[PDB]
From Swiss-Prot, chain A:
Subcellular location: Nucleus speckle; Nucleus
Description of how the protein assembles with itself and partners: Component of the 17S U2 SnRNP complex, a ribonucleoprotein complex that contains small nuclear RNA (snRNA) U2 and a number of specific proteins. Part of the SF3A subcomplex of the 17S U2 SnRNP complex which is composed of three subunits; SF3A3/SAP61, SF3A2/SAP62 and SF3A1/SAP114. SF3A associates with the splicing factor SF3B and a 12S RNA unit to form the mature 17S U2 small nuclear ribonucleoprotein complex (17S U2 snRNP). Identified in the spliceosome 'E' complex, a precursor of the spliceosome 'A' complex. Identified in the spliceosome 'A' and 'B' complexes.
Stated name of the protein: Splicing factor 3A subunit 3
Tissue-level expression: Ubiquitous.
Name of encoding gene: SF3A3
Transmembrane segments: none
Range of the intact protein held here: 392 to 463 of 501
Its biological purpose: Component of the 17S U2 SnRNP complex of the spliceosome, a large ribonucleoprotein complex that removes introns from transcribed pre-mRNAs. The 17S U2 SnRNP complex (1) directly participates in early spliceosome assembly and (2) mediates recognition of the intron branch site during pre-mRNA splicing by promoting the selection of the pre-mRNA branch-site adenosine, the nucleophile for the first step of splicing.
From Swiss-Prot, chain C:
Interaction with SF3B3 and SF3B5, as annotated region: 88-144
PTM comment text: Phosphorylated. Phosphorylation occurs concomitantly with the splicing catalytic steps. Citrullinated by PADI4.
Residue(s) at site: Interaction with SF3B3: 45
Compartment list: Nucleus; Nucleus speckle
Function recorded in the entry: Component of the 17S U2 SnRNP complex of the spliceosome, a large ribonucleoprotein complex that removes introns from transcribed pre-mRNAs. The 17S U2 SnRNP complex (1) directly participates in early spliceosome assembly and (2) mediates recognition of the intron branch site during pre-mRNA splicing by promoting the selection of the pre-mRNA branch-site adenosine, the nucleophile for the first step of splicing.
Oligomer and partners: Component of the 17S U2 SnRNP complex, a ribonucleoprotein complex that contains small nuclear RNA (snRNA) U2 and a number of specific proteins. Part of the SF3B subcomplex of the 17S U2 SnRNP complex. SF3B associates with the splicing subcomplex SF3A and a 12S RNA unit to form the U2 small nuclear ribonucleoproteins complex (U2 snRNP). Within the SF3B complex, interacts directly (via HEAT domain) with SF3B3, SF3B5, SF3B6 and (via HEAT domain) with PHF5A. The SF3B subcomplex interacts with U2AF2. Identified in the spliceosome C complex.
Protein name per its UniProtKB record: Splicing factor 3B subunit 1
Family: Belongs to the SF3B1 family.
Superkingdom: Eukaryota
Residues of the full protein shown: 1161 to 1304 of 1304
Repeat (HEAT) residue spans along the chain: 3-41
From Swiss-Prot, chain G:
Subcellular location: Nucleus
Assembly and binders: Component of the 17S U2 SnRNP complex, a ribonucleoprotein complex that contains small nuclear RNA (snRNA) U2 and a number of specific proteins. Part of the SF3A subcomplex of the 17S U2 SnRNP complex which is composed of three subunits; SF3A3/SAP61, SF3A2/SAP62 and SF3A1/SAP114. SF3A associates with the splicing factor SF3B and a 12S RNA unit to form the mature 17S U2 small nuclear ribonucleoprotein complex (17S U2 snRNP). Identified in the spliceosome 'E' complex, a precursor of the spliceosome 'A' complex. Identified in the spliceosome 'A' and 'B' complexes.
Signal peptide: none
Name the UniProt record assigns to this protein: Splicing factor 3A subunit 2
Zn finger intervals (Matrin-type): 2-29
Taxonomic placement: Eukaryota, Metazoa, Chordata, Craniata, Vertebrata
Family: Belongs to the SF3A2 family.
Function according to Swiss-Prot or TrEMBL: Component of the 17S U2 SnRNP complex of the spliceosome, a large ribonucleoprotein complex that removes introns from transcribed pre-mRNAs. The 17S U2 SnRNP complex (1) directly participates in early spliceosome assembly and (2) mediates recognition of the intron branch site during pre-mRNA splicing by promoting the selection of the pre-mRNA branch-site adenosine, the nucleophile for the first step of splicing.
UniProtKB/Swiss-Prot annotation, chain I:
Gene responsible for this protein: SF3B2
Residues of the whole record sequence present: 458 to 689 of 895
Outcome when changing residue 50 to R: Moderately diminished formation of omega-N monomethylarginine but greatly reduced formation of symmetrical dimethylarginine. Abolishes formation of omega-N monomethylarginine and formation of symmetrical dimethylarginine
Modified residues (Omega-N-methylarginine): 51, 58
Impact after mutating residue 50 to A: Moderately diminished formation of omega-N monomethylarginine but greatly reduced formation of symmetrical dimethylarginine
Protein name as catalogued: Splicing factor 3B subunit 2
Localization per record: Nucleus; Nucleus speckle
Entry comment on modification after translation: Methylation at Arg-51 by PRMT9 is required for the interaction with SMN1.
Mutagenesis / variant outcome for changing residue 58 to K: Does not affect methylation by PRMT9
RNA sequence: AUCGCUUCUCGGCCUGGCUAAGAUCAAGUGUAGUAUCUGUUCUUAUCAGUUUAAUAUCUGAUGUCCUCUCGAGGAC
């Protein structure tokens, strides 16, 4: 495995997502790809909000107070 | 680029402030309302004011656009 | 007289702008510039906007000839289509977080504001008043 | 079990036809349809990795009754 | 769709007007810009009715309109400041009954931009130069000289741009046979933008900046800069030379101050309020419409009050300093955006709403029943002479040119019995409002 | 057909009239085209006055014909941008 | 234009691809 | 019927499906051109007229095959022009007895204009050629271009101004002869065509 | 110094318009307010990529061109390719022989056919929307093919008349869990052509 | 019927004279700038300074007290 890809791909900084088991994935591409996944889709289903575009920016457990069941 | 292009009215840069751009837009809107006869007639004859009184109010509002800077 | 052939040359320029080589994009930008300056005031703004949808992704190029062609094409499109669509393209990127992207967007917006200082007041976006100063002008809300 | 093996198809039903049937029925994140180095033709069976396990379950249960290119397409859990 | 749009009812609301000897003869010519078309009229004062001699559509927005006459010329050339960057000086040809462009000098970009000059236009009183200044931070002045065939030979203007200097009004002062000068109501804007607390915006005030055009030195230099306490909403020039002193008069809310070039008495005359007016006293009275009329020996001014009454003020210059200005309400006229006091018994006031009034000034201006307030008359700085509303005594209204501007709503139908359908337009401002039904035959 | 250098004057135009040599005759002074010579060229200031009387508003040869703007530059009205005489800086 | 898919490299001339025969190390890297 | 087009401060025309029987309000069509429209005159069901605050008349039709029970759909501007004054009201009705059922718009400056739709392609081409000849033969007095003045706010689209057509008949006789030679016709024939266009109403 | 994405989502009415790196901007609220309007366009994706725009293909093949229908109806391509194939077999001796002795009347068809194809047979092409932005893809995902609707090739292959055999199981199984917002017309939302759903 | 030899049919598989080798030849710039070859490239530890949309770049120490002989033990 090379290291120049690990430098100039963002993989040198590992980003954690709290709702998918607080999983720390390498690279910001994986963290920005969590908003369409399998286990983290189950995580936002366990939050109590449907998977919408407004749920495509939330990365915290508290953000479900500003979910689709907040205004109508 | 050019020095007068950056020195032109409505010009800016990559570090231009949002309040400065909003103040320049408001000053340009006031100058366009003062220059245009139809816009001044539409914004003047709607209220009970004279045309020169509306022009003086717009001249005061041009300085009022630099009223609260940050 | 080119308005009979703008619709003919539209897919050729669309295929030319998607090419890998910068020469095709630069010369197609010159095509868009001369076609925009040619038939201005004739209602062909739909194909011009469709060509602008391929030209405006190519503003990140670093070579001087292709970026001069991009700047000339942007000037011709701002003349032909109007400053409202150019302001709509530049409003979401004038306050960009990146320094170089907002610098290029500010250069394009400064060229548009130099060309269209008078017409940008009516095409200014509707932003409400905030805590710094009042922004919504009440003179535009007056009806006679 | 997000990956589902979809078979029972012919040469007319390909990876893009299976992607169109997925866009009709249930979304698949990735497609794995390897081919031989001599023939280079689609066998009609491929691994469609779905975005959710419920999509693969609905493909195996509800969507395993269509006739893809004349043959009955069957989706199994993989 | 392919639409060939044609205007049927022309707009008649004159946003600005000038008058003089623009017809090239002894007949008085008044040119009023009624929007996209400017109409020049030379009506007979003996008949008293106003008739338009010609009308030309320029297809643009005029920000400043002015006229000027050369040294000894019988025709007053009209310099038009439009939204385009080409300032056009034209001479009216009465043989063709139309205006021919003598010259057209490009200055900048088109449209009503902030730094584009053309918002304010003025000319020298000796026919020496014409100055065009922007709303902010741009000014220029081109020397106008007579050619060998008595042609208006234009020149390259000199740059007079200063950083963050807005202009309220400007006028070319009467310098006689010397080098010409122009005064402007400058206002600084750099300190208001620099200071975020807004203290410098309250500390800022309008200043009279008189710049002398050094024609021999081929340069423009600011001669005098006097800061004024009152903000200048208007500015007028007193007729210098043999008709009185050479100076300016700045009007504000119930305060008119006259100052000459140098040490002169600042006669801060209060405005003559109406005798028990029903309007509120919070709204200040300012000279919205000003018209300086110079006679063969003396001179006078006409001002518009808050109620709209035309007030005549004499020029008691007395060759030393501005002593008295007998501000008496000469007549009661309608709500006019601009008023012009011509010679030979003519006085045109362009109404902002309703019919403009062309009155015949048969008297000398002293035929007024209202009281007179003088600048030399002392007061307790709380009231003036209560000028009651007198009738049309000094000037009798002889023409009422009906204008539909401003327009509110309209509806056209063939409900009435006529050769053409009736278009009823409900329009007007304040109590000056009507529904005008128009039908043809 | 341009160069990134050679800013021209950026000065306010005057009554002096531009002038073109035969080596670069017929070119537009801004975009270097040959189509529709519409608007005359004004050269502002002492570009005309003095030893540079009747010279080229381009390279510097002895001028023979009146310089012009093309119609394409005056579509956006670039002719009011200022003096187009090249000053080598 | 000439392209080496094993190297993924474009070539301006024919002799540029004729001299592209590094290519052995790129072929060993792209073999797996 | 089953649709209401409302003019907002930002959007010139927003069409909402007026399902009064279904008791549901859904915006069928939106707009992209920002205009403070102060007038409305629907020439058709999908056509909406707007009079902007900068004095621009814009007639915009909706796109064809547009779903009435959908949203996020724009309407293309069929025509756009600048009248030189702030247009107040507009009504799609015949302002003269007989002739052409045009649209009459009254401006706030005291102007009223009728936008006669040219149903003849040859007459529209002759009018366009006459306008292109007159834009170069007779320059404006203000110095601004006629196409620049008629398209100050937004660019013009399929709009012909009758002021230049009226001023072409008021030109000099040598200029009228040059314009007739450029138009390959007679000056009296051009005056008769302008008189027929005026009498079409 | 700068707030998180939750404060930007609470402050702005559109949390989907907030970017991942918009919080590090100098005016994040103004950028979110400008990005939430109806007529805005996003930044092109090359500002985050190390790769230059449309540059890293380097190994694929493409079709040359697709001419429009009226140009192919004039049929210039047939004798143009015939002339190119005839010139490819020529030698340079024959090339200068034809250079000093030219042969005209090669195509020589008319002027009226091209005049009709330019004017009478002139067809307006397909133009995209004002807010469209082309990127490295944007030529493959042409379904925006509605969800919940089978394709015409799959309907013809399964013998679906215009009653698919799996439509009864799709009606008995309810909506699919992958696309719950997709409505299938005819069985769930009671569909013109092959698009029998949305 | 197996085996070796001979002969023939059918299917993919190596296959253009002589003379003096018949003779002779073969020319562009300059200034900027871009793209592609080829070479050099990228695993030590957290934190801080600078930098950046963010990375990258970027400057500094990489478990302490005592004892024994980079190693071990002790209240730690
Ligand atoms: Zn996650
Ligand atoms: Zn030269
Ligand atoms: Zn040019
Ligand atoms: Zn110069
Ligand atoms: Zn290789």
């Amino acid at each position: 495995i090379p290291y120049w890809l690990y430098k100039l791909h963002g993989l040198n900084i590992n980003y954690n997502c709290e709702i998918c088991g607080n999983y720390t994935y390498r690279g910001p591409k994986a963290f920005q790809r969590h908003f369409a996944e399998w286990r983290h889709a189950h995580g936002m289903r366990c939050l109590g909000i449907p998977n919408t575009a407004h749920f495509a920016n939330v990365t915290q457990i508290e953000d479900a107070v500003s979910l689709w069941a907040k205004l109508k | 680029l050019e020095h007068l292009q950056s020195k032109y009215i409505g010009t800016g840069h990559a570090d231009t402030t949002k309040w400065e751009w909003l103040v320049n837009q408001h000053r340009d809107s006031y100058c366009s309302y003062m220059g245009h006869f139809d816009l001044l007639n539409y914004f003047a004859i709607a209220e009970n004011e004279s045309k020169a009184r509306v022009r003086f109010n717009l001249m005061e509002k041009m300085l009022q656009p630099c009223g609260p800077p940050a | 007289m080119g308005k009979d052939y703008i619709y003919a040359v539209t897919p050729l320029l669309e295929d030319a702008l998607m090419d890998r080589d910068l020469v095709h994009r630069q010369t197609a930008s010159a095509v868009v510039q001369h076609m925009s300056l040619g038939v201005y005031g004739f209602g062909c703004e739909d194909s011009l906007n469709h060509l602008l949808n391929y030209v405006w992704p190519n503003v990140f190029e670093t070579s001087p000839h292709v970026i001069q062609a991009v700047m000339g094409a942007l000037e011709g499109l701002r003349v032909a289509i109007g400053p409202c669509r150019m302001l709509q393209y530049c409003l979401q990127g004038l306050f960009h977080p990146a320094r170089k992207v907002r610098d290029v967007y500010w250069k394009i917006y400064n060229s548009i504001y130099i060309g269209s200082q008078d017409a940008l007041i009516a095409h200014y976006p509707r932003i409400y008043n905030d805590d710094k100063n009042t922004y919504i002008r009440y003179e535009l809300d007056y009806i006679l | 079990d997000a990956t589902v093996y979809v078979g029972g198809l012919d040469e007319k039903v390909s990876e893009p036809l299976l992607w169109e049937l997925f866009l009709q029925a249930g979304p698949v994140v990735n497609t794995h349809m390897p081919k031989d180095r001599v023939t280079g033709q689609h066998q009609g069976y491929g691994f469609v990795e779905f975005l959710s396990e419920e999509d693969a379950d609905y493909a195996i249960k509800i969507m395993n009754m269509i006739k893809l290119y004349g043959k009955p397409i069957r989706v199994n859990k993989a | 769709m392919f639409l060939y749009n044609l205007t049927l009812q022309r707009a008649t609301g004159i946003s600005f007007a000038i008058h003089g000897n623009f017809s090239g003869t002894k007949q008085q010519e008044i040119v009023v810009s009624r929007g996209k078309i400017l109409e020049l009229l030379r009506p007979d004062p003996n008949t008293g009715k106003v008739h338009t001699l010609l009308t030309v559509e320029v297809f643009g927005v005029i920000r400043s309109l002015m006229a000027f006459r050369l040294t000894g010329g019988t025709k007053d050339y009209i310099v038009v400041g439009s939204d385009s960057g080409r300032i056009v000086i034209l001479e009216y040809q009465p043989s063709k009954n139309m205006f021919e462009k003598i010259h057209q000098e490009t200055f900048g970009k088109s449209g009503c931009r902030r730094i584009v000059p053309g918002q304010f236009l003025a000319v020298d009183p000796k026919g020496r130069a014409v100055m065009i200044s922007a709303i902010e931070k741009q000014k220029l002045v081109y020397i106008l000289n007579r050619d060998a065939a008595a042609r208006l030979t234009i020149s390259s203007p000199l740059e007079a741009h200063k950083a963050n200097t807005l202009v309220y009004h400007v006028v070319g002062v009467d310098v006689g046979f010397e080098n010409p000068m122009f005064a402007c109501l400058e206002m600084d804007y750099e300190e208001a933008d620099n200071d975020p607390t807004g203290e410098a915006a309250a500390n800022t005030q309008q200043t009279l900046t008189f710049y002398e055009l050094d024609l021999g030195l081929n340069h423009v230099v600011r001669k005098y800069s006097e800061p004024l306490e009152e903000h200048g909403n208007f500015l007028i020039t007193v007729p210098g030379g043999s008709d009185g002193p050479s100076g300016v008069l700045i009007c504000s809310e119930n305060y008119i101050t006259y100052k000459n070039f140098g040490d002169q008495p600042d006669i801060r005359c209060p405005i003559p309020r109406r005798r028990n007016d029903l309007d509120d006293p919070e709204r200040g009275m300012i000279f919205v419409c000003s018209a300086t009329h110079k006679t063969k020996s003396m001179f006078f001014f006409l001002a518009q009050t808050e109620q709209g009454d035309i007030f005549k003020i004499t020029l008691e210059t007395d060759e030393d300093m501005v002593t008295e200005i007998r501000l008496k309400y000469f007549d009661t006229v309608p709500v006019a955006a601009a008023m012009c006091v011509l010679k030979t018994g003519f006085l045109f006031v362009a109404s902002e709403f309703g019919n403009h009034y062309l009155y015949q000034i048969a008297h000398l201006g002293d035929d007024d029943e209202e009281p007179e307030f003088s600048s030399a008359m002392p007061l307790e700085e709380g009231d003036t002479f209560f000028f009651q509303p007198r009738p049309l005594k000094n000037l009798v209204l002889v023409d009422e040119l009906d204008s539909l501007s401003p327009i509110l709503f309209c509806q056209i139908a063939d409900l009435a019995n006529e050769d053409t359908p009736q278009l009823y337009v409900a329009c007007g401002r304040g109590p000056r409002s009507s529904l005008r039904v128009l039908r043809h035959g | 057909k341009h160069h990134p250098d050679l800013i021209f004057c950026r000065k306010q135009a005057g009554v002096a009239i531009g002038r073109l040599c035969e080596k670069c005759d017929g070119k537009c002074v801004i975009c270097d085209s040959y189509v529709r010579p519409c608007t005359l060229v004004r050269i502002c200031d002492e570009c005309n006055y003095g030893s540079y009387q009747g010279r080229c508003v381009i390279c510097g040869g002895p001028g023979v014909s009146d310089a012009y703007y093309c119609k394409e530059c005056t579509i956006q009205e670039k002719d009011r941008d200022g003096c187009p005489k090249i000053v080598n800086l | 234009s000439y392209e080496c898919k094993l190297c993924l490299t474009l070539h301006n001339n024919e002799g540029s691809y004729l001299a592209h025969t590094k290519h052995q190390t790129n072929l060993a890297r792209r073999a797996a | 019927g089953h649709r209401v087009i409302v003019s907002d401060v930002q959007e010139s025309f927003i069409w909402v499906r007026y399902k009064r029987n279904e008791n549901q309000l859904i915006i069928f069509a939106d707009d992209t051109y920002p205009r403070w429209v102060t007038t409305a005159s629907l020439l058709d069901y999908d056509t909406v007229a707007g009079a902007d605050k900068f004095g621009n008349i814009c007639v915009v039709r909706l796109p064809p095959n547009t779903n009435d029970e959908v949203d996020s759909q724009k309407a293309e501007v069929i025509m756009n022009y600048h009248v030189g004054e702030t247009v107040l009201s507009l009504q799609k009705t015949t302002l003269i007895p007989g002739g052409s059922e045009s649209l009459v718009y009254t401006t706030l400056s005291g102007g009223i204009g009728i936008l006669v739709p040219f149903t003849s392609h040859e007459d529209h081409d002759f009018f366009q050629h006459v306008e292109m000849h007159l834009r170069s033969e007779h320059p404006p007095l203000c110095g601004r271009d006629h196409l620049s003045f008629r398209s100050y706010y937004f660019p013009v689209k399929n709009v012909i101004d009758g002021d230049l057509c009226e001023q072409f008949n008021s030109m000099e006789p040598n200029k009228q002869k040059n314009v007739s030679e450029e138009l390959d016709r007679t000056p009296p024939e051009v005056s008769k065509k302008l008189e027929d266009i005026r009498t079409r109403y | 110094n700068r707030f998180t994405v939750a404060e930007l989502k609470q402050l702005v009415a559109r949390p989907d318009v907030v970017e991942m790196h918009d919080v590090t901007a100098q005016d994040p609220k103004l950028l979110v307010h400008l990005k939430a309007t109806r007529n805005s366009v996003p930044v092109p994706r090359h500002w985050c990529f190390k790769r230059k725009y449309l540059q890293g293909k380097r190994g694929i093949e493409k079709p040359p061109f697709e001419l429009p229908d009226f140009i192919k109806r004039t049929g210039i391509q047939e004798m143009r390719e015939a002339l190119q194939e005839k010139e490819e077999q020529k030698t340079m001796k024959s090339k200068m022989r034809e250079k000093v002795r030219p042969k005209m009347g090669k195509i020589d068809i008319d002027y009226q056919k091209l005049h009709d194809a330019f004017f009478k047979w002139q067809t307006k092409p397909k133009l995209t929307i004002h807010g469209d932005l082309y990127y490295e893809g944007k030529e493959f995902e042409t379904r925006l093919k509605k969800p919940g609707d089978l394709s015409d090739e799959l309907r013809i292959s399964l013998g679906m008349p215009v009653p698919p055999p799996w439509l009864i199981a799709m009606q008995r199984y309810g909506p699919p869990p992958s696309y719950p917002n997709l409505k299938i017309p005819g069985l769930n939302s009671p569909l013109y052509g092959d698009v029998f759903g949305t």
